[PDB]
Amino acid sequence: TVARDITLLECVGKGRYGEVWRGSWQGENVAVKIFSSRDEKSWFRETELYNTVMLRHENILGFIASDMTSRHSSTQLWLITHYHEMGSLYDYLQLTTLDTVSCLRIVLSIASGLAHLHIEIFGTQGKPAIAHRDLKSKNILVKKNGQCCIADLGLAVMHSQSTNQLDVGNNPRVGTKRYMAPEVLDETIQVDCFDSYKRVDIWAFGLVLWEVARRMVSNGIVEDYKPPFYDVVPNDPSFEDMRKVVCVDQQRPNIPNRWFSDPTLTSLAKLMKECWYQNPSARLTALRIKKTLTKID
Ligand SMILES: O=C(C1CC1)N1CCN(c2ccnn3cc(-c4ccc(N5CCNCC5)cc4)cc23)CC1
Numbered sequence: 001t002v003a004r005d006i007t008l009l010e011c012v013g014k015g016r017y018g019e020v021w022r023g024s025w026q027g028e029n030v031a032v033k034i035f036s037s038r039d040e041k042s043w044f045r046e047t048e049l050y051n052t053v054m055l056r057h058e059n060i061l062g063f064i065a066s067d068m069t070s071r072h073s074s075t076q077l078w079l080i081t082h083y084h085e086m087g088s089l090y091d092y093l094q095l096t097t098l099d100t101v102s103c104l105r106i107v108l109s110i111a112s113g114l115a116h117l118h119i120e121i122f123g124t125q126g127k128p129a130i131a132h133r134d135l136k137s138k139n140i141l142v143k144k145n146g147q148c149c150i151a152d153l154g155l156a157v158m159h160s161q162s163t164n165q166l167d168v169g170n171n172p173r174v175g176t177k178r179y180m181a182p183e184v185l186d187e188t189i190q191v192d193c194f195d196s197y198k199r200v201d202i203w204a205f206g207l208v209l210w211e212v213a214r215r216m217v218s219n220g221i222v223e224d225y226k227p228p229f230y231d232v233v234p235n236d237p238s239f240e241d242m243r244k245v246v247c248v249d250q251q252r253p254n255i256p257n258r259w260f261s262d263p264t265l266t267s268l269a270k271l272m273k274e275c276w277y278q279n280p281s282a283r284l285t286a287l288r289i290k291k292t293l294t295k296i297d
Contacts, residue, residue, distance in 0.1 A: 003067040003078055006032060012087065017042075022083055029083035030064060034076050041171045042154020043077045049153050053127050059113030061141060061151035084149070086142040089208070093137065093215050094225045100264050100297075102146055103216040107209055107268070108293040109147040110140055114205060115286035117150070118198050120161055128158040131197030134175040135204040137211050137227075159194035166194055177242050178229060179204045182278050185243040189280075199280040205289070206275025209268060210253045218262035228253050252276050267296045 006025040013020035018036035022029055035043040047066040049055070056062070062082035069076045086092050089106070098106065120129040132153065139152035155175065158167045168191075175184065181203040183189040183196070190196045207228040214223035229237070231254075232245050245251045252273070259265035271292060274284050284292075 001067050001069075002065045002080060003069040006030065006080065008032060022085075025064070025080070029085075031081050031083045033079045033081070035079070039154065039173060040077055041169070042152075042173060043079055045156065045169050045171060046079060046152075046154045049130075049156055049158075053130070053158065054125075055117075055127065055130075055153075057113065057116045059109050059116065059147060059149045061149045081151070084141040084143055086144065088138045089140045089142055089148060089212070090137040092142045093211060096215070097222045098212070098216040100216070103212060103264065103268075104293065104296060105146045106142070106148055107212055108290070110150065110205070110208065111286060111290040111293050113140075113148065113150040114201060115290045117156075118201070118286045120159070128160040129194060129198075131157045131159075131194065132201050132204075133157060133197055134179070135201050135208065136176050136179045137208055138176075140208065157194070157197045166192070175200070175204075177237050177239050178227060178233065179207055180239070180242055180246070181280070182247050183280055185239065186247045196280065198286070199283050202275050202283045202286065202289075205286075206272040207253065209272040209275065213259065213265055213268050213272070214256070216262075216265060218258060218265055221258055223256060247278075250278065264296060267292075 002025065006023045008021045008023040010022045011019060012022050016036060017039050019034040021032045021034065023032045024030065043066065050063040050066070064080040064082065066079050069078060114135070117130040117132060121127045132150065133155040134152065135150065139150070141149050141151060143149060155171055155173060159165070181200040184200055189200070210228060211226070215225060216222070229245060232251060233241050255269045259269055271289065277283050
């Protein structure tokens with residue numbers, strides 16, 4: 001198989017999800033995500049997704065193959081994709097600051113990535129609508145040309161409008177809590193409705209928008225990298241911790257005033273706020289957000 005022709009070179013990530021390695025395969029770098037036992041359904045669902053739906057897009061992490069392998073004293077579950085040496089947005093934002101152009105390129109490209117997933121394309125070159133359900137800075141990769149690509153589709157949801165059936169899988173994993181929409185947290189989400197799942201992505205996206213914006217320099221100031229809600233939740237926040245801050249207190253990420261000196265960060269502040277409506281139906285769509293980012297300077 002592919003697994004046995006891969007040589008594993010360097011561990012570049014370690015978490016509750018398992019591990020990420022840089023390895024080589026046919027002389028090309030690849031990322032090998034080795035899944036924890038707790039997350040094996042994600043590997044299954046993502047293997048399934050990648051093997052049923054044509055997802056390939058500049059801003060979706062490029063899939064190579066999935067495989068099992070008899071490794072250590074276990075059978076490892078590996079998902080093998082293209083490799084982005086910059087790492088995640090999370091990693092990258094912590095090593096550097098952005099300018100107007102690099103900020104816009106990052107956030108637009110993610111918008112385009114989200115929009116492509118969310119839309120249904122009809123016909124044999126088409127696809128079902130897909131909702132990610134766990135978008136965050138750690139599972140968006142940064143390419144050297146400055147564009148991003150979305151990974152980690154283990155919790156994805158698909159829907160098609162001809163069939164009007166909704167595939168949610170059978171996954172014990174629910175999203176990353178720090179990024180969880182109000183309606184998910186207070187359990188008011190309309191689970192029968194596909195638009196609900198898209199709308200949770202937008203919330204999450206708006207939180208990412210904020211992480212990124214903080215690192216864009218204006219007039220030679222910039223904010224330190226911070227995860228959304230850093231000031232009001234501890235590390236690894238509970239589902240209950242978040243409900244209190246997001247739903248009960250209706251708190252939203254603080255916009256620093258320095259952003260209002262700058263016409264880009266002013267326009268993105270408006271944008272991220274229209275991703276954070278308590279009312280899901282008031283949130284902008286991926287496509288609209290894409291159209292807007294395309295017109296900002
Ligand atoms: O599933 C996830 C999230 C939940 C972790 N993914 C997919 C698996 N990942 C990767 C996919 C595809 N490429 N890729 C490159 C890195 C990577 C590369 C370098 C670094 N570092 C280590 C810290 N010092 C600087 C460079 C970190 C991560 C990580 C990944 C991470 C994002």
